[PDB]
Amino acid sequence: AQEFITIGSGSTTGVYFPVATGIAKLVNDANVGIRANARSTGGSVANINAINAGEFEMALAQNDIAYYAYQGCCIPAFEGKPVKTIRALAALYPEVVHVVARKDAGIRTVADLKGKRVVVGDVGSGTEQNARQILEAYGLTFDDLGQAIRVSASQGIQLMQDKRADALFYTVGLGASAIQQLALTTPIALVAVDLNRIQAIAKKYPFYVGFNIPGGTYKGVDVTTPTVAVQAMLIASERLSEETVYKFMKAVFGNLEAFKKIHPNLERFFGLEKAVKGLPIPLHPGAERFYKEAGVL
Ligand SMILES: N[C@@H](CCC(=O)O)C(=O)O
């Protein structure tokens, strides 16, 4: 318990939080000199800013946001100043853009969001970035919305449940508690996001891939949902030593069975081979060593 590691995540009812919490517990149980804890946050942007500032040693973040940060481009949060202090540890699972709408709000498509009260994501979230890009693909801006609300997942579904919001965006792994919870109490529907419309701007944002949310994933949503997704990644500060990261990797990913128990998305989508597939930023030296020894690299 000599070296402290705080892992930035997201809303407590998202997927980043339980994954980070599980990862922290697993590394702590390994007794390798690391004392880890997860911290709820606004998401990808907030997490990357925290790692750069030296506040967090690790964090979960979307591959697209990590790329923009490392390159100092593409989104207002990082344009003009690259964040070269972040390194990738592993690609984890697909993060799907969920566009949730109350059935009584007159919303069947993204275009219908015009004049509506929409939760666009949390402050410092990756979700907000995707929402802004997707809305533009449909000819809209936050100003065209009735209200552009930035709150946590728990606050967001509360607004939806009390009818103070009409729709909500959430770039998150399938099965997020926040969405499951909302589906059980409120009549909701998932709005589609056309990949082709997105493809029209794929040159600016190349990380989107087509993704179908299986019918029955959430209560009351029995039809499949055609949308888009990016990739969740575990990242770390370049400042962490190779030895520390290497020990961490063996304690967390070295125990694959234990790791997959952390969340259904890991059991369903995680694999060491895919963990190093199409990474947007450089792997941390400690992770490279782990993957080389595992035969993955
Ligand atoms: N990818 C989302 C967070 C999703 C989650 O918390 O599971 C974001 O960066 O805003």
Q: What is the dihedral of CA 262, 263, 267, 268, to 10 degrees?
A: -170
CA 296 to ligand 1 centroid distance, Å: 27
Q: Is 107 helix (H, G, I), strand (E, B) or coil?
A: coil
Spacing, Cα 278 to ligand 1 middle (Å): 19
Buried b (16+ CB within 10 A) or exposed e, 130-160: bbbbbbebbebeeeebeebbbbbbebbbbbb
Helices (H), ranges, the chain: 16-29, 44-53, 63-71, 126-137, 153-161, 177-185, 195-199, 242-252, 256-260, 264-269, 272-275, 285-294
Residue with tokens 């964040």: 83
Identify the residue whose tokens are 């809303």. Answer: 11
Helix (H, G, I), strand (E, B) or coil at 87: strand
Q: Is the CB of 52 under 6 A from ligand 1?
A: no
Ligand 1 contacts CB of residue 128 (under 6 A): no
Report DSSP state, residue 149: E
* Nearest ligand 1 atom to alpha carbon 122: 10
C-alpha span between 291 and 283 (Å, rounded): 10
Is the torsion defined by CA of 158, 161, 164, 165 positive or negative? positive
- Relative to beta strand 225-237, strand 86-102 is antiparallel
Cβ 16 under 6 angstroms from ligand 1: yes
Burial (CB < 10 A; 0-12, 13-18, 19+), residue 42, is: buried
* Cα(205)–Cα(230) distance, integer angstroms: 11
Burial of 166 (0-12, 13-18, 19+ CB in 10 A): buried
Task: Give me ligand 1 centre to Cα 158, in Å.
Answer: 18
- Hunting for tokens 């339980």 — which residue is that? 18
125 lines ligand 1 (CB under 6 A): yes
Distance CA 261, CA 19 (A): 10
Give the residue from 257, 290, 104, 124 showing the smallest Cα distance to 188.
104
How far away, in angstroms, is 275 Cα from ligand 1 center?
18
Cα 119 from Cα 206, distance rounded (Å): 24
20: Cβ contacts below 8 Å, ≥ 6 apart: 7, 8, 9, 38, 39, 59, 60
With beta carbons less than 8 A apart as the criterion, state whether 120 and 131 touch: yes
Q: DSSP code of 281?
A: S
Give the Cα separation of 202 and 219 in Å (integer): 32
Residue 172: CB within 6 Å of ligand 1? yes
| Beta bridge partner(s), residue 233 | 61, 91
Q: Is 111 exposed, middle or buried (0-12, 13-18, 19+ CB in 10 A)?
A: middle
What number of other Cβ atoms are within 10 A of residue 29's Cβ?
11
Whether 127 is in the pocket of ligand 1, judged by its Cβ within 6 Å, is yes
Ligand 1 and 18: CB distance under 6 A: no
Calpha distance 93→262 (Å, rounded):
13
Contact 7, 58 (CB under 8 A): yes
Q: Is 40 in the pocket of ligand 1 (CB under 6 A)?
A: no
242-252 helix and 285-294 helix, angle to the nearest 10 degrees: 50
Q: Encode 175-209: b = buried (16+ Cβ within 10 Å), e = exposed.
A: ebbbbebbbeebebbbbbbbbebbeeeeeebebbe
Q: Which atom of ligand 1 is nearest to the CA of 11?
A: 6
- Rounded Cα distance between 212 and 219, Å, is 16
For this PDB entry, the determination method is X-ray
Pocket test for ligand 1, best of 7, 12, 62 (most atoms within 8 A of CB): 62
Rounded CA separation 216/253 (Å): 31
Q: Are 288 and 242 in contact (CB under 8 A)?
A: no
| Separation between Cα atoms, residue 231 and residue 95, nearest integer Å | 5
* Run of H or E including 227: strand 225-237
Q: For helices 177-185 and 153-161, what crossing angle results, to 10°?
A: 10
Task: Specify burial of residue 230 (Cβ count, 10 A radius: 0-12, 13-18, 19+).
Answer: buried
CA 282 to centroid of ligand 1, rounded, Å: 21
Please tell me the distance between residue 190's alpha carbon and the centre of ligand 1 in angstroms. Answer: 18
Instruction: Supply φ then ψ for residue 92, to 5 degrees.
Output: -105, -55
Whether the CB-CB separation of 238 and 56 falls below 8 Å is answered with no
Our CA angle for 227, 61, 69, nearest 5°, is 105
- Interatomic CA distance for residues 236 and 95, integer angstroms: 19
Query: Is 1-92+232-297 in CATH node 3.40.50.1360?
Result: no
Parallel/antiparallel/unpaired status of strands 167-172 and 117-119: parallel
> Looking at domain 93-231, what is its CATH homologous superfamily?
Periplasmic binding protein-like II (3.40.190.10)
Domains 1-92+232-297 and 93-231 share a fold: yes
Q: What residue ranges do the domains of the chain occupy?
A: 1-92+232-297, 93-231
